[PDB]
Amino acid sequence: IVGGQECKDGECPWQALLINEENEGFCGGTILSEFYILTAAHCLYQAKRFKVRVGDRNTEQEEGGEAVHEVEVVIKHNRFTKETYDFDIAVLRLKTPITFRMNVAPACLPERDWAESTLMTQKTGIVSGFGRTHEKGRQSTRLKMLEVPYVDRNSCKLSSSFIITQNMFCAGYDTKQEDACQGDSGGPHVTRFKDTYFVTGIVSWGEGCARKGKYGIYTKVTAFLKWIDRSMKT
Amino acid sequence: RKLCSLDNGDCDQFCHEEQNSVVCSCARGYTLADNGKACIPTGPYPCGKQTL
Numbered sequence: 552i553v554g555g556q557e558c559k560d561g562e563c564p565w566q567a568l569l570i571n572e573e574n575e576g577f578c579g580g581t582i583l584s585e586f587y588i589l590t591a592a593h594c595l596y597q598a599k600r601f602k603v604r605v606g607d608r609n610t611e612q613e614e615g616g617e618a619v620h621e622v623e624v625v626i627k628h629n630r631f632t633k634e635t636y637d638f639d640i641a642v643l644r645l646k647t648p649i650t651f652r653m654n655v656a657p658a659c660l661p662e663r664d665w666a667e668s669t670l671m672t673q674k675t676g677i678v679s680g681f682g683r684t685h686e687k688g689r690q691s692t693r694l695k696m697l698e699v700p701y702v703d704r705n706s707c708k709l710s711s712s713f714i715i716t717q718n719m720f721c722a723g724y725d726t727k728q729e730d731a732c733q734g735d736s737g738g739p740h741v742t743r744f745k746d747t748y749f750v751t752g753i754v755s756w757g758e759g760c761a762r763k764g765k766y767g768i769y770t771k772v773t774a775f776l777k778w779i780d781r782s783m784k785t
Numbered sequence: 786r787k788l789c790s791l792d793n794g795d796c797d798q799f800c801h802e803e804q805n806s807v808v809c810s811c812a813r814g815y816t817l818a819d820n821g822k823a824c825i826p827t828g829p830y831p832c833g834k835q836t837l
């Protein structure tokens with residue numbers, strides 16, 4: 552996250568961190584239930600073997616609530632393509648269930664129509680992660696969050712050098728120095744409604760981080776709600 | 786602005802228009818209250834709530 556603020560105690564409890572063999576975070580995820588994590592499909596090709604960490608806000612300290620979980624089943628969308636990052640979505644089934652506690656809790660999955668007319672028409676959503684704090688920097692050791700305005704669909708296609716499919720939406724700022732960034736991929740985009748936070752996006756891609764005239768590109772979770780549902784049923 | 790378009794039909798979470806009336810529902814792990822509008826968590830750590 553470029554800009555924004557640190558997630559304070561209990562503020563981003565649905566954040567997950569995909570960690571490689573060296574225990575280094577390379578992507579985020581969203582806690583959906585005690586057994587399921589939502590992430591980006593392109594994140595799967597970033598490590599050979601990886602586990603999922605939850606309840607962590609500061610990767611340098613051990614604040615008692617953190618917990619590593621092995622992945623049992625990887626369920627990648629069969630239509631994912633590295634060419635355009637269309638269908639950039641995957642669900643992970645863990646071997647052991649997550650214990651909810653302070654800093655560890657699921658985000659809500661919304662219903663499609665209500666989400667599209669009610670959540671995605673709000674002014675902003677919230678993205679969070681342990682990604683880079685600047686385009687050229689190193690991963691954050693602190694979990695960060697950032698309010699990102701939803702971006703007009705036409706404006707977004709016009710700004711992009713790459714195709715924006717209907718399985719994607721844009722969020723961020725035209726010129727302001729705030730945006731998701733590398734390492735934040737796979738992480739949550741959530742939208743608040745009456746103090747309840749609903750999953751609305753997955754951090755997917757961007758041309759750099761916080762560039763002028765460029766926005767963040769997110770997987771449109773409302774397009775995959777039945778798919779997610781099916782994936783969690785088995 | 787009528788029904789669900791008017792302040793989310795007074796619903797806490799999901800709103801649907803059915804036979805010209807508002808119908809509220811809630812995410813998994815919540816139960817719809819007696820007023821048919823509020824959503825009550827069934828247990829601890831309901832989805833979507835910051836842990837404070």
Ligand SMILES: C[C@@H](C(=O)N1CCOCC1)N1CC[C@H](NS(=O)(=O)c2n[nH]c(-c3ccc(Cl)s3)n2)C1=O
Nearest residue numbers: 633634635636713731732733755756757759767768
């Ligand atoms: C342009 C894009 C890219 O590789 N694409 C090819 C596939 O089709 C989609 C576009 N790209 C360059 C590398 C980059 N990966 S990254 O370094 O992990 C990264 N940089 N910025 C970002 C994000 C900024 C805002 C969001 Cl949201 S993700 N991710 C990324 O997505």
Ligand SMILES: [Ca+2]
Nearest residue numbers: 609612613614
């Ligand atoms: Ca820690």
